[PDB]
Design a protein around this ligand. Sequence first.
Ligand SMILES: Cc1cc2nc3c(=O)[nH]c(=O)nc-3n(C[C@H](O)[C@H](O)[C@H](O)COP(=O)(O)OP(=O)(O)OC[C@H]3O[C@@H](n4cnc5c(N)ncnc54)[C@H](O)[C@@H]3O)c2cc1C
Ligand SMILES: Cc1cc2nc3c(=O)[nH]c(=O)nc-3n(C[C@H](O)[C@H](O)[C@H](O)COP(=O)(O)OP(=O)(O)OC[C@H]3O[C@@H](n4cnc5c(N)ncnc54)[C@H](O)[C@@H]3O)c2cc1C
Lengths: 304, 305
Amino acid sequence: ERDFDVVIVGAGAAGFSAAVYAARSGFSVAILDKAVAGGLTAEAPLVENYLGFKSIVGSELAKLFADHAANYAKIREGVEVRSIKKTQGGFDIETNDDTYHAKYVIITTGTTHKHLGVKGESEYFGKGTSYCSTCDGYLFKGKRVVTIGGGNSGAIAAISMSEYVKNVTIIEYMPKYMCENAYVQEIKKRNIPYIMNAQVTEIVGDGKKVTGVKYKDRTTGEEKLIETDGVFIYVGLIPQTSFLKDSGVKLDERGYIVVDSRQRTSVPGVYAAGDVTSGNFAQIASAVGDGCKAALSLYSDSIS
Amino acid sequence: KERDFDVVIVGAGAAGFSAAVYAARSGFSVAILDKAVAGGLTAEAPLVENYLGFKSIVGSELAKLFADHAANYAKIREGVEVRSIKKTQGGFDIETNDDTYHAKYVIITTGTTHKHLGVKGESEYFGKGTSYCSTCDGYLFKGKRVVTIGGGNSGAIAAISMSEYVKNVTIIEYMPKYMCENAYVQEIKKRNIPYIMNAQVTEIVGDGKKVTGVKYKDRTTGEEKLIETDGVFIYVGLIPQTSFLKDSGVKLDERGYIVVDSRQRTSVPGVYAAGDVTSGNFAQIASAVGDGCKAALSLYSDSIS
Ligand SMILES: Cc1cc2nc3c(=O)[nH]c(=O)nc-3n(C[C@H](O)[C@H](O)[C@H](O)COP(=O)(O)OP(=O)(O)OC[C@H]3O[C@@H](n4cnc5c(N)ncnc54)[C@H](O)[C@@H]3O)c2cc1C
Ligand SMILES: Cc1cc2nc3c(=O)[nH]c(=O)nc-3n(C[C@H](O)[C@H](O)[C@H](O)COP(=O)(O)OP(=O)(O)OC[C@H]3O[C@@H](n4cnc5c(N)ncnc54)[C@H](O)[C@@H]3O)c2cc1C
């Protein structure tokens, strides 16, 4: 049970979508995830732009995704892929488990949360600093929090947290709102301060817990300190493509897997879709769509 | 009563709806124009089981959910048909069958229309047994004999869905082998639904008032046979809804589909497209939603700089 027609790496929106179509296309399919299934979708506080769901908590939506995919593929949680190399008869997937064999592969490993790189970030990790609001937002009920990064992720994180924390403050590097207008309105509606043009210089605390965050205005230099209890960091993503070393699948300057209009990688038989691919739009809807494409594109070629 | 919007989306189908939600959340005033009532081809899908999140759901049901979702973000003008798109200084002029609409940007999501067989009796029997939508007219032949021309995914699921209330169903595929995904192939065999292959329909026959049967010539032996059916459903292809684009400047491929880049941009600045209308599309709700999402986000991205 380590041999399948198609092996998909990553149990997230893209992967799940690819699975259902791979199966329905008549292929035996296996989805391998280095952790429990769900992907970043499970960490989404509230999803309102996935067609068909007016408003659904990410973890809940991820549950529906997985259960849907479950009816067509074997979901192997806890299996991390470390390499992929083609062989005359498919490919070999070296894992933290054993070794899997597939004729075709679809890489849907998404991304990881980027780090800020400032004094006190490493030190206070698990001491008031977090990269997942849905995971640790509860810790700060009735408390003060600062969200570093005002993009769509940071915006909804803070918007959702403001429901139960004492107060939320958003600190954005760019001299403008980086989150979609729907969040801009919601943020202004809940009176959530959104500090733009601010560069965080330091996360500070009492050696035990976080007590505040230092940031300076990029233009005037004015440095300021704001006291909170929790600091959540949403300042970017990183493609999870490290396991593709010596695989032959081309990547762009930032680590993303380059693919053609039919989700094909530079390596015959290997397809990719989702937040992991180059130029992706970072949404569940596009991942689902592109995961669909990869699978049908896979089939299309399978029939010569 | 307004005709001016930051962005006009042409076509209220899966792609248009997704694009609408995204364009609206990005701050734009949005309007979705459809020549008929909203829903698009999704509403004619008997049973959708490959759109992530819904294990199984009747097409008409999913379309409603889509429309209700989109309505919260845009104005859906049913019964308005775009006849042309012309670029002006302020953006675009969109001539319809209900005055000219104006928009800064436009997204084309008009999908496709069903293709016609082109055989004798197809016209003269339309509405008298002939049809291109089983979800629409299938229930009429509940208990009678039927034949669906075309064994693609659409035709297949049409036959599979009807076999639940009809007498019998015979598919007639032009290509030699099965042309529908494996999931449908094993459903057909299970239900014992005949799947005549390498058959080329030559005529739809009836008694002048109602359809009685269809004649086809096996592309191999060259012969010609006949089958007893009350109703016939046609799913032999699709045509891009792009004729209204004549002289607009938007590049179409040799088959009429809009050609777009990786960011859903057509050849005309300010005009984007997504869904079954785009050349190379995979003809699924999922990818339609996905590209609709991209088009709107791409449109937003280009609006700033
Ligand atoms: C706070 C927040 C809010 C968001 N809100 C929205 C929203 O409202 N709307 C929206 O459309 N999107 C939203 N998103 C984004 C959305 O969640 C992502 O776009 C989507 O999850 C990407 O799907 P994916 O399948 O490409 O990858 P991911 O979901 O990132 O999944 C990749 C999977 O592969 C696994 N994996 C990685 N490397 C390996 C390996 N080497 N071997 C095996 N398995 C591996 C991972 O463990 C993971 O489960 C939000 C994200 C965040 C963080
Ligand atoms: C029987 C059948 C079963 C199917 N089953 C599945 C399935 O299980 N899974 C799946 O993923 N897909 C399925 N599909 C396909 C799916 O329905 C389509 O891929 C999807 O609807 C395409 O979306 P779209 O937005 O591109 O266009 P459409 O939904 O086709 O919508 C285009 C819209 O634009 C309008 N329009 C056209 N021209 C104009 C104009 N000039 N002015 C104004 N409005 C205009 C139309 O009236 C229409 O409402 C099925 C299709 C059929 C026929």
